[PDB]
Subunit: 112 residues, 4 copies
């Protein structure tokens, strides 16, 4: 009964990044899920839980380019799809990986 | 005559991350280069320059897992290969993308 | 009925920083509060709320040095007291300012 | 013959933060220096060197509020003066402490 959640903050305006598409995939495979953050910059249902959450490597494709585009970065943005690889060791643990995001930089961390 | 350089700092000990392997690839392709940072956590020759640097999307595969492993994170580390996608718009510009790295989090930015 | 909360994550081990002392003070004054984070790296009661929360500048003194010391950085640590100044404009708003912390670097942000 | 340098990057536009005032002071004292970053977001002469650099705690007052103000955050900005405390142990070592800055968050690290 593990769990994988996330969270996006736009450091340009201190608000949660809303309606950003997030791709989810197992390492070496194709997208398996596609979600859009709510107003809190989170997703209602965990990105992964129970059976689903299998120990291994995953990748999340945060669509930063489109998000900043709507809030305005340019025709060929520096950040298009912020990609995040990570390995989930224990299948019964909680993994909260937020994303602090800016047009030209970002923080990826295992928060609480 | 554009240029792509990078830099790795281990925020766990304030020192540059040395001898870390860095994979380089164009979006959707296979590795095209493989380098190992020196003692300053940089690479002698630009990761990309002149002809090579074509406008588009690239990906750098920082091998964080192995680096921390040598400095010690575990059998199934949270971070294995920190992956970084980005788009290089102008082919004649300088792009310096450093990496602030920690066992459980990291910063990716367009520095100077 | 505004609110000021915070949160500390130790990026060295992906866990919340527990029992870290946090000083709170208005700009130019002496400490007014002193708290110790719980196991979630948070404090049970808001650091500021209602009447208390007056528009202006505050400072939080995160005692990183002692925290890392207990988990081990040295005799004269790089980070001793991570100091964070910020201005609270609206008195009725919620301000969540977490702290991503490492022996040699840290992130300060207005999260959700 | 130690050295203290710094560097400011505006993560909102990937450029160095130019002409930002930086206050320098020893712990518990008044400003001792006041500098303004050049176009590279650095200062020509080290903020501290040789004799000057004495082992102990210092504080740098990055004037983020004014900088973003000129580039535009509001009347009562979240960040006014980003304050950074740190301890310099060895007097003969090089300490490079850059600042990744955004209207609502920032990274402080011991870079190379
Ligand atoms: O949902 C979250 N809550 C928090 O308090 C937090 N702190 N960092 N990341 C976080 N994510
Ligand atoms: O090579 C670099 N030099 C610097 O001064 C710097 N600051 N941030 N990233 C950087 N990379």
């Amino acid at each position: 009964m593990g769990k994988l959640t996330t969270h996006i903050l736009d450091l340009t305006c201190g608000k949660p990044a809303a309606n950003v598409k997030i791709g989810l995939k197992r390492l070496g495979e194709s997208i398996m899920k596609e979600v859009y953050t709510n107003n809190d910059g989170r997703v209602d249902v965990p990105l992964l839980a129970g059976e689903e959450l299998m120990s291994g490597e995953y990748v999340m494709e945060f669509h930063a380019g489109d998000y900043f585009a709507s809030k305005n970065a340019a025709d060929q943005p520096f950040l298009t799809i912020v990609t995040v690889r990570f390995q989930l060791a224990d299948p019964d643990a909680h993994y909260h990986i937020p994303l602090l995001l800016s047009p030209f930089g970002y923080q990826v961390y295992r928060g609480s």
